[PDB]
């Protein structure tokens, strides 16, 4: 076993060295009202890592539209990061616009619990989704041998910002839930006056007293989430390999 | 912070009480040559949890065809588990065929690190993906307010089984990687007769010495993983709320 930050905790406070300079987490993002996704990869100039950075870069504007920043992490130097970014631009034709943390002592890695039994020296493929208050909302741990599904990271952030904004819980497989579709779930009643306004009216669909929902997300919001999943499901038209 | 099992560790040995009887983990699955996905939910008779059990049950045959079993987990009693399964069968017309662990003392929850800052008493939405050797391969921590995307759990298990069988690493967003499509990544050479036998005489595409791939998976394997993602992206034809 190892120790990790937990969902509901403030992301651990730290200044990190990146190829963009020194950044304080989570404050750099909190002070702009931004969410961030921090993700790790084992090493620069590795093929799975390179596919992931290109996947994040292609989705960069999707993240920026949600008000989400990206930051990467490995135990490599900032020099390594800059040369890898130049490799990706020269060979794939894609610019990596977001910072990468350089963690050559493993300090950030040990703090975030990103050293698993697959490697004592390089991080697994961790993801921390952190809201605009600096609180950890979701964590994914993918292994050395498997690339992430980046569209699922976009679905998580979008669904969580809708849940927070509309005061709703999000069903499995939203926005394509097999029971309620794009429906969002009404939380249990907090106070008794905000139990009567709901209980003593309709306006909610219900399977039982503990299971009610409505569809309060904008068509734009629902369609943006559905687009993430359609992109994840689409056979790519042209491969970025075929044009060096 | 809190402690968790790590990727590459043997799943912690434990006997658990389920609504199907007592099971030893991971030995119950390992002894059959099966993978298992252990996932947790905060409490029976909660609506997000209910949508996720229905999602897993609808995908149960997809898991069984991969040689993957499912097992759930909450702090509720086996009685609660049985009454909740009856509620789902009566109100949604879906049978939940897989066991749920009853953890009323929080023993399993504490050993798997499933008690986060969102609740001292109820697990978050944890997922442990465990191979047929009993080794942890991936871990997801989703929060109380957000349902999982179960088709990404299928993609992970399908991609890891293919990676293990074909001796390949899996790119981001496989099988729809924007650089190599359904390509799988050749790992760095094992022997010195490998770095010889495939150096120039290999049948690989390469972007660089450290980035080579081929497409050794069957169209059946690729299309199985693409169907997961098509299902995730499809607006349901019929919702299960307008029937029983």
Curated annotation (Swiss-Prot), chains A, B:
Keywords: Antioxidant, Cytoplasm, Disulfide bond, Oxidoreductase, Peroxidase, Redox-active center. InterPro entries: AhpC/TSA, Peroxiredoxin, Peroxiredoxin_AhpC-typ, Peroxiredoxin_C, Peroxiredoxin_TDXH, PRX_1cys, Thioredoxin-like_sf, Thioredoxin_domain. Disulfide bonds join 206-212. The active site is at 49 (cysteine sulfenic acid (-soh) intermediate). Substrate binds at residue 125. Residues 5-162 form the Thioredoxin domain. It is found in: Cytoplasm. Its main location: cytoplasm. GO terms for cellular component: cytosol. Its EC number is 1.11.1.24. It holds the Pfam family AhpC-TSA. It catalyses: a hydroperoxide + [thioredoxin]-dithiol = an alcohol + [thioredoxin]-disulfide + H2O. GO terms for molecular function: antioxidant activity; identical protein binding; peroxiredoxin activity; thioredoxin peroxidase activity. PROSITE patterns: THIOREDOXIN_2 (PS51352). Induction: Up-regulated by hydrogen peroxide (at protein level). GO terms for biological process: cell redox homeostasis; cellular response to hydrogen peroxide; hydrogen peroxide catabolic process. NCBIfam families: PRK13189.1 (NF009668). Homodecamer. Pentamer of dimers that assemble into a ring structure. The active site is a conserved redox-active cysteine residue, the peroxidatic cysteine (C(P)), which makes the nucleophilic attack on the peroxide substrate. The peroxide oxidizes the C(P)-SH to cysteine sulfenic acid (C(P)-SOH), which then reacts with another cysteine residue, the resolving cysteine (C(R)), to form a disulfide bridge. The disulfide is subsequently reduced by an appropriate electron donor to complete the catalytic cycle. PANTHER family: ALKYL HYDROPEROXIDE REDUCTASE C, THIOREDOXIN PEROXIDASE. Thiol-specific peroxidase that catalyzes the reduction of hydrogen peroxide and organic hydroperoxides to water and alcohols, respectively. Plays a role in cell protection against oxidative stress by detoxifying peroxides. Belongs to the peroxiredoxin family. Prx6 subfamily. This is Peroxiredoxin.
């Amino acid at each position: 076993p190892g120790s990790i930050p937990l969902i509901g905790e403030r992301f651990p406070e730290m200044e990190v060295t990146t190829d963009h300079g020194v950044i304080k987490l989570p404050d750099h993002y909190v002070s702009q009202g931004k969410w961030f996704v921090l993700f790790s990869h084992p090493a620069d100039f590795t093929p799975v890592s390179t596919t992931e950075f290109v996947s994040f870069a292609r989705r960069y504007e999707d993240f920026q539209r949600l008000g989400v920043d990206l930051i990467g992490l490995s135990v490599d130097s900032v020099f390594s990061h800059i040369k890898w970014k130049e490799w990706i631009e020269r060979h794939i034709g894609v610019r990596i616009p977001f910072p990468i943390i350089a963690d050559p002592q493993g300090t950030v890695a040990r703090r975030l619990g990103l050293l698993h039994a697959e490697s004592a020296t390089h991080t697994v493929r961790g993801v921390f989704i952190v809201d605009a208050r600096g609180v950890i909302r979701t964590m994914l741990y993918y292994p050395m041998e498997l690339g992430r599904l980046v569209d699922e990271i976009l679905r998580i952030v979008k669904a969580l910002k809708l849940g927070d904004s509309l005061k709703r819980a999000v069903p499995a497989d939203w926005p394509n839930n097999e029971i309620i579709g794009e429906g969002l779930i009404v939380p249990p009643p907090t106070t008794e006056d905000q139990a009567r306004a709901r209980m003593e009216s309709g306006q909610y669909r219900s399977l039982d007293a503990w299971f009610s929902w409505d569809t309060p997300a904008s068509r734009d919001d629902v369609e943006e989430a559905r687009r993430y999943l359609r992109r994840a499901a689409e056979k790519p038209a042209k491969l970025l390999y075929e044009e060096a």
